[PDB]
Amino acid sequence: AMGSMERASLIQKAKLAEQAERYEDMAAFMKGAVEKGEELSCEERNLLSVAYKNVVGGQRAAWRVLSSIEQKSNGPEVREYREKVETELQGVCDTVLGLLDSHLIKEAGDAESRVFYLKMKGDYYRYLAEVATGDDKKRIIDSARSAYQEAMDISKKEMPPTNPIRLGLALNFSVFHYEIANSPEEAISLAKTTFDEAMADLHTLSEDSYKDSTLIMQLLRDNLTLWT
Amino acid sequence: AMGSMERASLIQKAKLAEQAERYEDMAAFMKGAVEKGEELSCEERNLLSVAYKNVVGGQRAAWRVLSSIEQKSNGPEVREYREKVETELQGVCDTVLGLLDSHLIKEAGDAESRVFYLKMKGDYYRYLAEVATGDDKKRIIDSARSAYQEAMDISKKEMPPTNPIRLGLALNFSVFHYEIANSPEEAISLAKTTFDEAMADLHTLSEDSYKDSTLIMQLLRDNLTLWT
Amino acid sequence: AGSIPGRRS
Amino acid sequence: AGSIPGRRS
Ligand SMILES: *Cc1ccc([N+](=O)[O-])c(OS(=O)(=O)C(C)C)c1
Ligand SMILES: *Cc1ccc([N+](=O)[O-])c(OS(=O)(=O)C(C)C)c1
Ligand SMILES: [Ca+2]
Ligand SMILES: [Ca+2]
Ligand SMILES: [Cl-]
Ligand SMILES: [Cl-]
């Protein structure tokens, strides 16, 4: 699709699409950039993540609206339309997972890139789990857990406890535990331990890094306040 | 595309898509409903208008962002991407205009339907005019003016001065004069006369109709405040 | 200035 | 509750 466009042009257009709030375009541009086969820089990884987060975020919000209407009703139209949105959402998740598997993760050697992509893998399996029903749900849940766990193991070995990627991974894994895995106690323990270990490391940071880390720490605290 | 789905199901799904903020879907459902060939009820006309207003509104906002970046710059990427968005916007406007021409307007005999569709025709030519350059702009501008003028002539003969469709038509025609036709004095005169004639007719209205009419009258006043 | 917002029904 | 919002870069 994007095979005729220069990598640098795809990246430039992804940034313009973000400014224009054209997130479907942004995701297509970044998919094209990934398919050029080169590794992604830190900024380019962020563009890929922002693009697909916005696309799947719109789909998840629509699926929740339709699922709530469908549950209140219980013609075929509400179910049929919820199913259509769900299939589209699953297709976006499968596209992202496919990019990670071909071949972003296998080429990611540095902790910052590998943790970033594995967190993404856990997130997109988590979005699949939100709409899955039955034993399909079990294997999807295990795939999310496995990706998050590998990312956690790397992050604890290779990054300081204030690193924003490490903090966001722990935040999202804690949400996985609470909302997906029916493990609220594990969610609370992870959020508390992550927060406390980051607090103890803030003294090492510059003013700008302090702002980055404390922003995410506040998200951990917000969840803990809602969960306790 | 939607030819296999029942008209009533398309309408139901358009309402669900609105609740889910899936306006592209909503527009496709309503296009399918129009293509069934039957006239649209008042509620169905509103669904058609809301769907496409949201779709073209997103495109117009993106085009304005990209056009502003492009003007600041003066590689090909900003222009190329603005051109892509512009072509997509023109395609949506052409689709709407095509539905009005085949065959909504020709079958619309009552003032409420005919004025509604002609106002829509003026609006979508106006959106085309916002992105047009040169002598193309002249004929597009005249097409918008002609549609608005026919709608105005019908509305003055057939509707009270407080009718919300009549008020919204006058509001949008005044914006056409100010923003497109370089006729700010005509814009101000139309907005003032419309407001004053509606004010004098409010005494005839129920509480609910009073609320509907005064809401649009406030939009006229807001424009007059910005223009004077 | 502002046309009919027209995005909610 | 809330994951990383992650929608702005
Ligand atoms: C163009 C227009 C003017 C007035 C109304 N109205 O208040 O009925 C209208 O209908 S609408 O549902 O599309 C409203 C702009 C939300 C259209
Ligand atoms: C998952 C995640 C955690 C932290 C950051 N960060 O603050 O750098 C991050 O990068 S990002 O640009 O996508 C941010 C969520 C806007 C991702
Ligand atoms: Ca090249
Ligand atoms: Ca039928
Ligand atoms: Cl590598
Ligand atoms: Cl008729």
Instruction: Note whether A44 and A11 are within 8 A (CB).
Output: yes
CA C6 to chain centre: 3
CATH number at residue B93: 1.20.190.20
CA B200 to chain centre: 26
CA A85 → CA A56, A60, A62, distances in Å?
11, 9, 7
Please indicate, yes or no, if residue B101 is contained in any of the structural domains. Answer: yes
Measured from the CB, is residue B168 less than 6 Å from ligand 1?
A: yes
Measured from the CB, is residue C8 less than 6 Å from ligand 1?
A: yes
Declared resolution, Å: 1.4
Please indicate, yes or no, if residue A187 is contained in any of the structural domains. Answer: yes
Name the method of structure determination. X-ray
Q: And the tokens for D5? A: 């919002």
Please indicate, yes or no, if residue B86 is contained in any of the structural domains. Answer: yes
Q: Virtual CA dihedral for A149, A151, A152, A153, nearest 10 degrees?
A: 90
Please indicate, yes or no, if residue B135 is contained in any of the structural domains. Answer: yes
Q: And the tokens for A188? A: 């609370």
Say yes or no for a CB contact (<8 Å) between B171 and C9: no
Please indicate, yes or no, if residue B2 is contained in any of the structural domains. Answer: no
Residue that has been written with the tokens 């979508």 in this structure: B124
Chain C, 1-9: which have a CB under 8 Å from a chain B CB?
1-4, 6-9
Pure H helices in B74-110: 77-99, 105-107
Instruction: In whole angstroms, give the CA distance from residue A185 to residue A176.
Output: 12
HSE of A210, CA atoms in CB hemisphere, 13 A: 7
Closest C-alpha among A128, A117, A116, A207 to residue A167: A116
Interface check for B204 against chain C (CB to CB < 8 A): the answer is: no
Q: Distance from B56 to chain C by nearest Cα, in Å?
A: 10
Q: Which residues of D touch A49 (CB under 8 A)?
A: 6, 9
Measured from the CB, is residue D4 less than 6 Å from ligand 2?
A: yes
Q: And the tokens for A59? A: 């789909």
Instruction: Note whether B89 and B127 are within 8 A (CB).
Output: yes
Please indicate, yes or no, if residue B213 is contained in any of the structural domains. Answer: yes
Per the structure, the complete domain to which residue A16 belongs is given by 7-227
| Angle made by CA atoms A15, A21, A23, in degrees to the nearest 5 | 75
| Angle made by CA atoms B220, A20, B91, in degrees to the nearest 5 | 75
Instruction: In whole angstroms, give the CA distance from residue A104 to residue A101.
Output: 6
Q: Virtual CA dihedral for B172, B174, B178, B183, nearest 10 degrees?
A: 140
> Is the link from the previous residue into A177 a cis peptide, with omega within 30 of 0?
no
Residue that has been written with the tokens 């990934």 in this structure: A34
Measured from the CB, is residue D6 less than 6 Å from ligand 2?
A: yes
Residue that has been written with the tokens 């669904």 in this structure: B47
Helices and strands, counts by H and E, chain C: 0, 0
Please indicate, yes or no, if residue B119 is contained in any of the structural domains. Answer: yes
Helix axes A111-131, A164-175, angle to 10 degrees: 20
- How big is chain A, counted in residues? 228
Residues with their C more than 2.5 Å from the N of the next written residue in chain C, i.e. before a break, are none
Closest C-alpha among A34, A11, A153, A55 to residue A100: A34
Q: And the tokens for A213? A: 């880390």
* DSSP codes of every residue in A160-204: -TT-HHHHHHHHHHHHIIIIISS-HHHHHHHHHHHHHHHHTTGGG
Q: How many domains does chain A have?
A: 1
CB within 8 A of A9, min separation 6: which ones? B75, B77
Q: Which residues of A touch B92 (CB under 8 A)?
A: none
**Which amino acid, B136?**
D
Instruction: In whole angstroms, give the CA distance from residue A138 to residue A40.
Output: 32
Q: Which residues of B touch C7 (CB under 8 A)?
A: 50, 53-54, 57
Instruction: Note whether B150 and B118 are within 8 A (CB).
Output: yes
Instruction: In whole angstroms, give the CA distance from residue A152 to residue A158.
Output: 10
**Which amino acid, B181?**
A
Please indicate, yes or no, if residue A142 is contained in any of the structural domains. Answer: yes
Instruction: In whole angstroms, give the CA distance from residue B74 to residue B131.
Output: 18
